[PDB]
Each structure stands twice: as C-alpha cells, then as structure tokens.
Amino acid sequence: SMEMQLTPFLILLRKTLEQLQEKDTGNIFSEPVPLSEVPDYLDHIKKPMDFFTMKQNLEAYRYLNFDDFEEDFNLIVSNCLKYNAKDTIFYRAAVRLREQGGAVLRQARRQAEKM
Ligand SMILES: Oc1cccc2ncccc12
C-alpha cells in the first residue's frame, strides 16, 4: 500500500528465509545446483534457484512484495521435483520443503499483509 515501509518488510523476508533454510536440514538447497556435476541440468531447468541466490536478490532489493520472494522459493521446489526421480531423497526433500516451508510462508505473508 501507500504507507508500507521497505525496512520492516526486508527484515521479515530475512527472518522468513532463515526459517525456510532451517527446514532444508541437509542444506541441499543452500547453494546453486553444481552445474559442473550436472551438465544436463539446464536442458530441463530454465531458471535454477537456491537460498544463497535468494539472499542476494533480497539484499539487492529485488523482492518488493511477498510474491517476488515466494516465487523464487517455489522455483527451488519445482526445479527439484522436475529434475530428480521420485524414488530419490532429493525429490522427497523438495516435497518436505514444500510442505514445511509452505507453513512458514503463509504466516510470513500474513505478517506482510498487516504492514
Ligand atoms: O545437488 C543438488 C542439490 C539440490 C537439488 C538438485 N537437483 C538436481 C541435481 C542436483 C541437486
């Protein structure tokens, strides 16, 4: 809205990002998928995403509404479901992050709406 302030919103996004990273207990989404180990990754995945990149986007003022932030989170999840077979831990880790992280995201968006 007209009066919504930037700094409390960024503080909220930082806290939310930390809470989401806590759900990724193996830290498999902490840094970009290592393209040197996965040379076919970009054949399947058009926009890689990870929590370090999200932190850099946050601090570069690229996230100005909650959708901007949640869309990149959803890329982390959807890219991982798309690339990895269902019988892998990586696939299940994306399911777990979607489920547990969705709860973090709903409460955070509610706080943003009060701003
Ligand atoms: O190394 C990784 C971490 C998280 C997700 C991945 N998805 C495909 C290939 C490698 C991955």
State how far the Cα of 51 lies from the Cα of 18, in Å rounded to an integer.
9
Cited resolution, angstroms = 1.4
Identity (one letter) of the amino acid at 4? Answer: M
Q: Mutation test of ligand 1: which of 78, 83, 98 has the most ligand atoms closer than 8 Å to its C-beta?
A: 83
Superfamily of domain 1-115: Bromodomain-like (1.20.920.10)
State how far the Cα of 52 lies from the Cα of 28, in Å rounded to an integer.
11
| Residue 38 Cβ < 6 Å to ligand 1 | yes
Rounded to the nearest angstrom, the distance between the alpha carbon of 105 and the centre of ligand 1 is 22
Tokens of 80: 């991982």
Q: Angle at which helices 6-23 and 66-83 pack, to 10 degrees?
A: 20
Identity (one letter) of the amino acid at 20? Answer: L
Name the experimental technique. Answer: X-ray
CA dist list (Å): 40 to 35, 45, 83, 84, 89 = 8, 9, 10, 12, 19
State how far the Cα of 46 lies from the Cα of 37, in Å rounded to an integer.
17
Rounded to the nearest angstrom, the distance between the alpha carbon of 4 and the centre of ligand 1 is 37
Which residue from 40, 50, 33, 48 is spatially nearest to 97, judged by alpha carbons? 50
Write down the residue that tokens 């806290």 correspond to: 15
Rounded to the nearest angstrom, the distance between the alpha carbon of 34 and the centre of ligand 1 is 7
